[PDB]
């Protein structure tokens, strides 16, 4: 019964086109609840789940304040980084930040994290101990020293270990019906003939939540991850996820192949035969 | 609830 709250922040420079784009999305497990989009009109933090709308103006006022703060820092970061790497003003660049906290079945703090990436790859990240930084390069080292002097970690550790978990539980409870839910997959199989000497078996997992799932193809023991095709667990659009896996099986042995579905909404891992 | 002490890089 583990859980987690995570925030993702995207910053994209718009060379010759004004202020950068800023997008902030908040999640609790695989369910999003808040968001901030510089392109949007409210120009404030907005709810994206029913259970968060019940919060007071105090909540949204301070959530919008803090999110704008993030924006300001990312707006300045884009320039700073462009400098460190002495890049041109001709190209677009991306900054991404991600912090959150994991709790166990008892909801007690488990892990904390705060990553920072630039142009698609790590730049700096807080270490598991929440006391030290990991610089990805010589430039990142400058941020590291800068941050050690500013006692930034000390602040994130306080947040990640307390406030973060404190509010995660608040959400987990307020959204009891929604978040503490655990929908089971509606599995099945489909046969597809492409040739006279072959066929395609597709194991399907649908309407399941959380997205955490593992589908496996097996020859009554034999692993077959070599000829299997798994598509990224995709969202359905109603809060549930989908996913499937297939293998090219020569006509005949197909009756010996069995699929394995592992999800926390299932007592015992399913095994589907054909 | 958002973190409250983001600092420049």
């Amino acid at each position, epitope marked *: 019964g583990s859980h987690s709250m995570r925030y993702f922040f995207t910053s994209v420079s718009r060379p010759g086109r004004g202020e950068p784009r800023f997008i902030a999305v908040g999640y609790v497990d695989d369910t999003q609840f808040v968001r901030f989009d510089s392109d949007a009109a409210s120009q404030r933090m907005e709810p994206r789940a029913p259970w968060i709308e019940q919060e007071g103006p*105090e*909540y949204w006022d*301070g*959530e919008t*304040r*803090k999110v*704008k*703060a993030h924006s*300001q*820092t990312h707006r*300045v970061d884009l320039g700073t980084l462009r400098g460190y790497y002495n890049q041109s003003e001709a190209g677009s660049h991306t900054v991404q930040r991600m912090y959150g906290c994991d709790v166990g079945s008892d909801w007690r703090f488990l892990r904390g994290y705060h990553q920072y990436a630039y142009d698609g790859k790590d730049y700096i990240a807080l270490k598991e101990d929440l006391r030290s930084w990991t610089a990805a390069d010589m430039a990142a080292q400058t941020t590291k020293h800068k*941050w050690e002097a*500013a*006692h*930034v*970690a*000390e*602040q994130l550790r*306080a*947040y990640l*270990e*307390g*406030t973060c978990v*404190e509010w995660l539980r608040r959400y987990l409870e307020n959204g009891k019906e929604t978040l503490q839910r655990t929908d089971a997959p509606k599995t099945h199989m489909t046969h597809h003939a492409v040739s006279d000497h072959e066929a395609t078996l597709r194991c399907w997992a649908l309407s399941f939540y959380p997205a955490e799932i593992t589908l496996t193809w097996q020859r009554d023991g034999e692993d077959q991850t070599q000829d299997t095709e798994l598509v990224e667990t995709r969202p359905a659009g109603d809060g549930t996820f989908q996913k499937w896996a297939a293998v090219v099986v020569p006509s005949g042995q197909e009756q010996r192949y069995t699929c394995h579905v592992q999800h926390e909404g299932l007592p015992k891992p399913l095994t589907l035969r054909w | *609830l*958002l973190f*409250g*002490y*983001a*600092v*420049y890089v």
Partner: T-cell receptor
Amino acid sequence: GVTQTPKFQVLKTGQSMTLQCAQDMNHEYMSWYRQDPGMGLRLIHYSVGAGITDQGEVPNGYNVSRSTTEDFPLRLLSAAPSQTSVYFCASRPGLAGGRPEQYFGPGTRLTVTE
Amino acid sequence: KEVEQNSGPLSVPEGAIASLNCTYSDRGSQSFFWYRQYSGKSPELIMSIYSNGDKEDGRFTAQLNKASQYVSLLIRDSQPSDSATYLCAVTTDSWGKLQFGAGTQVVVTP
């Protein structure tokens, strides 16, 4: 830390006074407060960074600017007997530092007569 | 206001314990401070607490209960020099406004 001058000041209803405030901690968040026996501390004006200024709880009668990040001069164009009190200056790191503590200045005591 | 403190002089004898309470309303508060202000001087920061629990430093002990949105300050082995009025301050973020209490005046008799 936070330095501010003058320490004491006498003014006649109508004089122009400018309370000087400076900080050397590379802070981006400075604030001005006035303390009175019946209300305690009350924000007048504050600035989260250079060029950015916003009114507080009792901004009336007071002017403020922030061309640089080191200073944050509080101005009174036409002194009023009501503006008699103790003015404390203050600063916070803002987005420049993780230490959330706000620091006060030594304070200036001002009195306005008719 | 948004932060409430013990309204009135808390007279304590030399060597005794002075206990200070504080209560805030914004559940989003993340930073909590304790300020000491001697008559005629400026507010001096003496305690900061960022996570709920106990923080001890010298004869000062600060507690934090976010669940009950409560903050305290325990001054051990009181000295007449501790005679001052103590301000409770709390905030939400680096851009949030600092919210102070009326301040509880503490008199340490000799």
